[PDB]
Amino acid sequence: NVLQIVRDHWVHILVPVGFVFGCYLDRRSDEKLTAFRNKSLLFKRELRPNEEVTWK
Amino acid sequence: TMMSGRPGRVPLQFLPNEARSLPPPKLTDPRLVYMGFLGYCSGLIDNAIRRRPVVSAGLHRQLLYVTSFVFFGYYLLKRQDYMYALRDHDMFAYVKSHPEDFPEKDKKTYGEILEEFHPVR
Amino acid sequence: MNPFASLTLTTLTILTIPIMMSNSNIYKTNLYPNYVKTTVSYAFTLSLVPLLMFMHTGQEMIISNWHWMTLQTVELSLSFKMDYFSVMFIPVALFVTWSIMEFSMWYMHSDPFINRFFKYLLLFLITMMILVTANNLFQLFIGWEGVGIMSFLLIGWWHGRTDANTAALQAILYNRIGDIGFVLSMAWFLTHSNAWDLQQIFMLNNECPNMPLIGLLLAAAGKSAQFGLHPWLPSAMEGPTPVSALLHSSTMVVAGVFLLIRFYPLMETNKLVQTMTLCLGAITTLFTALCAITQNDIKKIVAFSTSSQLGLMMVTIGINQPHLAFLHI
Amino acid sequence: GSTFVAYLPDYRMQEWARREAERLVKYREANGLPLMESNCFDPNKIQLPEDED
Amino acid sequence: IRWTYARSANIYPNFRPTPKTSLLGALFGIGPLFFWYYVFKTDRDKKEKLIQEGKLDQTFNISY
Amino acid sequence: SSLLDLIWLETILPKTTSFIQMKMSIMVSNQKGLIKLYFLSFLITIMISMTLFN
Amino acid sequence: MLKIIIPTTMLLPMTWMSKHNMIWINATVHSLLISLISLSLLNQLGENSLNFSLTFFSDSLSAPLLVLTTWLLPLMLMASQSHLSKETTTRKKLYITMLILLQLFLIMTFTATELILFYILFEATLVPTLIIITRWGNQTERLNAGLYFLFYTLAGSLPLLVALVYIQNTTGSLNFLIIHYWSHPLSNSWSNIFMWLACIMAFMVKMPLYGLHLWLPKAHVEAPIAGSMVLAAVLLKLGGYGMMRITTILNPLTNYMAYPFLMLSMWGMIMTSSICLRQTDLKSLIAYSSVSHMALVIVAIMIQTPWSFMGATALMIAHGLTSSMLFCLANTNYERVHSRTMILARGLQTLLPLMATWWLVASLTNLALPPSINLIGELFIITASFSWSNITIILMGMNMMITALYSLYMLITTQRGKYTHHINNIKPSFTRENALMALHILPLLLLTLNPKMILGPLY
Amino acid sequence: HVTKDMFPGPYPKTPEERAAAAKKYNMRVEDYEPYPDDGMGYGDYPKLPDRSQQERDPWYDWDHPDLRLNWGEPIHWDLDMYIRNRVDTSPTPVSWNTMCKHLF
Amino acid sequence: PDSWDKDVYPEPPRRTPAPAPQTSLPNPVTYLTKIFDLLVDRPVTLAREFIEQQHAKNRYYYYHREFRRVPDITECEEKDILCMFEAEMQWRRDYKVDQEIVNIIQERLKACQQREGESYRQNCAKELEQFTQVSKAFQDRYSDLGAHYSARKCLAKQKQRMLAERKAAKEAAAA
């Protein structure tokens, strides 16, 4: 019965929320290390006609 | 280092007027979040010591602890950033004004540097 | 295409089906020993064909089917050598195992754990087939240790008897003394020849030094129960008579002689190791026959007979006659 | 997880190295080059220090 | 219980430093270490001398 | 098992450390609480600082 | 890397907000889920590393250790479920909190781009283990065991902090990447010798190196089952990981510096293997076997060759799994007999056949039976040592023979013979214990199918 | 359930404590004999005969038939050395020295 | 099979004798291989053809990754970290490729030894001598680097080897 099993089963959602938050934080921290994107001498590439960034 | 005797420094200013030229810390700064976590822990310990339901005894008191910790942490972060900015500024100024003590090292390539090789046997 | 490889791999593969079915319903019924005996007989009649092809032509093949791992310049893969020795020994071993299992269906009739006993015999046979057909040193070591563990488990079959456990631990101790030399040989071959594969070892060793051959001789003496490391074989009679008939009589104990046979191209280029092999075989056969001459237990007498025959086999190895030693095996 | 580990893509680049080695050995055998070279770097680009002892 | 306690925990409180204990401890705890150190040091010095002199014939020695 | 592990290895680091620290603790903390001796030591200490550090 | 760290942190509020009768189920389920997430890290490259951010990186040396650390927690919870039945809910939650904090510290330790962060977490792991040992311990010697465990580690690791701050003051960085790329040789000097000693001794004392291994038997015997599991499986490998990370700056000083430690380890494996032959306690025997294995790992790391490093990594993983399984089996016997003495309960194969099968498989894996990864590491290290010197083969063979001897001695003494007559409280083995042994043993035989996953960065 | 006074102690030096130790280990005073008071930590523990367990009577009704021991009896310091699975000291028909000479 | 290059993995023409029965007795090998063909090779071929047509119904491609050449360690500054990183990655890739070249040569040697049978000591001199050259080169380039190997240490080893060679040549010429 909803609104009753939630009071006992609300705890289960916490570990999963932590995982998605950690993935988001990993991507957010990744966003700050783009100083050499498409500037490495090995993977120096010309952009596609509809490409702004080689990787995200 | 010792910046106590630094010239043009006011005796009891927490944040000088020249500190306002630096970007302020964001409200979502991880250090501010850690200060809020410290305030939450203080509230939980206060609940536990007084023999009260730890999680849900006083919501107003826990909110006050978190808010006070966040406020003081924000101002402390501002002062810390200003002090580190001063350190870097003085460093760069001194390096600029004393060229003879910091010469440009003649750049050298590894193909013409002889390094001893120690075999692993 | 070339049914030689398909049949030779099929025999070894079908030898393992009852092990997979050991968790099925047939393992809990009294038809399991007959099932395993039928499987062994079918494997024997199947393996009779590659021997026939070799007899007609002389077919020789190497099968490197699965690549397990590669460390730098060294590549390790599951490789099977299907030469004269393998295609001649497999039918004989399968025939003997089939006969011994049919005998055990009668001998071990009142033993509550007969399905387990039969399963163990199958496990030992599988390990011995792994040992015989191995093409590199790591696989042959796998079989080398598997047969030893099966010997330990089958000797101490009646685990309530102190002497059976003592004999099993004795066999383990002597086999580990041999394993020391085995590991020494493996290390030497990997360090110098840069391979555990037999082909590369045969190419890069025209004048094989003393150390790897001495390690191989130590391993062979340990597993074939030569004079230095002999006493474990007579003590291995604590196990059931079918175990003493299969493992410690005709199939397991010839493993050291077979190992020396497998490395015969390097053995003939060394004269001191051949001399040591000859002396060891002679002293072993004499001492074991002299022990046998006055024993009262029949199983002990026949075990000492087996040890003396192994000594004669290693004498034949010492006089540079490996194929004759294989025929005697 | 075992199935996932079994089917992990080759980020260690083993078959890539196999293909590179295959093409290099094809090129060198055909052109008469002696396979692998003893020096990893071309001696023209190393400036050794003159001893004058 | 007495057997296990005497074998494990009653040893040190009854220990007394004596010439016998001192000499046996020194021997059994120091002698093997220096013996093996001497053996391995001599072997490795010999091998290094042979390598420097170039007469060791390390052909096909790729993995170490 | 016994001679090395349970006796001599135990004697070398841990038992020796414990014995030395306990003896030093006993020596340091065994003071009768008389200001006579304390200020006599202070006088001795003051004299040493004047004559040994300059 | 935060996709693993954040769920581990969220394990704490979930545990503390759980129902009084649902802590174990939730903790086990979410720990298993966290472990599944950790599996993604195994994919590794032949190039530099998996540099997630400035703070954390992953490598094929750190990935298997992280996977083992994440996998161990559900097993520890399963083992601890039994003896904590009569405990209050708050104290059980505190125990689970200690385990979670230890996992978090280990996870952050194994990534650790910067060396002072590595030291801080490597020392932070010391507190939860100490609390577990000295709080939930059965005997009265747990206090002395905890004191030994604390003070050996701290005495070893205090000079390491001074060495690290000196290295950063001189070089300018402690980030492992810069340290590796800007490495410079160490001149044979007394100051460099003492810097080498300060860098090495902290990891040596936790291996444990022979002669500095006294704390380990006490700590392992007096700890609860979960503490013994974690100490034998993960906490011993911290020293090996640290040595592998730090020996990059100790060259060429290591060539002659290593001799005292090489001799100590080579003789101490024989010494501890022989000690295992005369032991009246299961836990002490398992602990001394761990000491022998870690001494051989020390030899591998000191030899400092690619085969040495691969063998050391494989042996670390295999030993962790095997020692955890052996400790769990010993605990299953102890919870029935309450004695912890080998000779009391005998002939248990007649009463518990499946547990006897588990005993046999664990003993065979400890015996290094091929093609188990235990023998893979053993053989790689033996070959590397033989290339180092052909005379090591004698000691290696002696160690192998004695190892087989005491492994089968431990199996035969407890499983074979005649049952003790007066012991009549030996109940059938529960499904929990059988599942614990199965989850210990199946990963080993699955990993032997893909040995490249545990062979380290030099594969 | 075992008390503090029931554990092994230090080497006995007086006849009274010798008798007390003999009573503790459930044997006669005339049959009690500790190890020599050397540096090694035997302390107060009877020095039983070095006879093996294999040569004990196989027809007595031992409480432990496999180990051939009786409940409450003093245990030899090296019991795990003589467990019928290891070194035994059973007399042989031929003397040790003659056997050594013949074998050598 | 086109799945591998025949030039990288050379094989002799594999000349085989022809059946020359000297007696009227029918040998069992031919009958057994015929029944083996009928009962094994035909269903296997049918299943393979079915699977191959199912694969041809859905065809897609994958490509070999090409890597550009970058400056090596010999032309990097003392404390320049970016070029050092690029050169180290390139050197590691070259090390892997060299290892696989040695693997190819070893496979050739093993195949020759197995194929030539009893006359391998004479008929496989070419593979043995190629392996001798490749092993000598590989040994010179990477031996004794240790666990913590890098391009800088390999360059130092090459530098000392060239210094020794130059000194020996000067001493021999000026002898």
Ligand SMILES: CCCCCCCCCCCCCCCCCC(=O)OC[C@H](COP(=O)([O-])OCC(O)COP(=O)([O-])OC[C@@H](COC(=O)CCCCCCCCCCCCCCCCC)OC(=O)CCCCCCCCCCCCCCCCC)OC(=O)CCCCCCCCCCCCCCCCC
């Ligand atoms: C690494 C950093 C990351 C993690 C940080 C780690 C620390 C975190 C927490 C820090 C402290 C803050 C909270 C502690 C307050 C103390 C209260 C307490 O005891 O607990 C009782 C209380 C439950 O009991 P109760 O029913 O209320 O009444 C019982 C009485 O309180 C009293 O019951 P009793 O008196 O009947 O029981 C007696 C018992 C009770 O005595 C205690 O338990 C005292 C508490 C421990 C001392 C705390 C020290 C201060 C912080 C130190 C942290 C050290 C970390 C460093 C690592 C080393 C580890 C030592 O004491 C004993 O049994 C004696 C033996 C002691 C055993 C050994 C001692 C070891 C203590 C070390 C603990 C260190 C970690 C603490 C973790 C949290 C523990 C609650 O616990 C709680 O419920 C509060 C826990 C936190 C609540 C979380 C809720 C938030 C979740 C919802 C939102 C989701 C968040 C995410 C957002 C996004 C999602 C959408």
Ligand SMILES: CCCCCCCCCCCCCCCCC[C@@H](O)O[C@H](CO[C@H](O)CCCCCCCCCCCCCCC)COP(=O)(O)OCC[N+](C)(C)C
């Ligand atoms: C345990 C951690 C420390 C806690 C400290 C107590 C927290 C409550 C205190 C509340 C704030 C007090 C600040 C007072 C308000 C104005 C201060 C201002 O007027 O004075 C300035 C001084 O500012 C204060 O010094 C800054 C105080 C901030 C303390 C935080 C640092 C703690 C170390 C890092 C641990 C993190 C703690 C975060 C949680 C609290 C100017 O000083 P100045 O006249 O020019 O020279 C005197 C000092 N000299 C001689 C050394 C140069």
Ligand SMILES: CCCCCCCCCCCCCCCCC[C@@H](O)O[C@H](CO[C@H](O)CCCCCCCCCCCCCCC)COP(=O)(O)OCC[N+](C)(C)C
């Ligand atoms: C019980 C009675 C018998 C019943 C069962 C009968 C059936 C027998 C089958 C059992 C074993 C027989 C051997 C058959 C092996 C075939 C499978 C093998 O080929 O797959 C392996 C693959 O196995 C996996 O790689 C290894 C398993 C993963 C191990 C991870 C453990 C799981 C996580 C648990 C926690 C971790 C704890 C330890 C920390 C490290 C190797 O494959 P590989 O040649 O390479 O390449 C795969 C294919 N490619 C080419 C497309 C890529």
Ligand SMILES: CCCCCCCCCCCCCCCCC[C@@H](O)O[C@H](CO[C@H](O)CCCCCCCCCCCCCCC)COP(=O)(O)OCC[N+](C)(C)C
């Ligand atoms: C207790 C359980 C085990 C714990 C761990 C033990 C491991 C620690 C051992 C430390 C390793 C060796 C330390 C120094 C090795 C350097 C080599 C040196 O000792 O040998 C000779 C040194 O000669 C003499 O040994 C001088 C030192 C004498 C004083 C040292 C005390 C000797 C015994 C002390 C052992 C105590 C260890 C435990 C401390 C509590 C070489 O002569 P020399 O060419 O000139 O010096 C070369 C070095 N240079 C180039 C920097 C100058």
Ligand SMILES: CCCCCCCC/C=C\CCCCCCCC(=O)O[C@H](COC(=O)CCCCCCC/C=C/CCCCCCCC)COP(=O)(O)OCCN
């Ligand atoms: C399980 C217990 C083990 C405890 C650890 C044992 C070894 C401890 C390591 C030695 C302690 C000091 C570490 C040095 C810190 C690193 C700093 C450094 O290396 O710089 C050296 C500093 O070197 C020193 O000063 C060392 C002095 C030693 C004083 C402390 C002695 C402690 C005990 C030493 C003997 C025992 C060491 C081995 C113990 C064996 C295991 C018990 C050079 O200094 P500079 O003056 O700046 O440069 C010289 C050019 N001008």
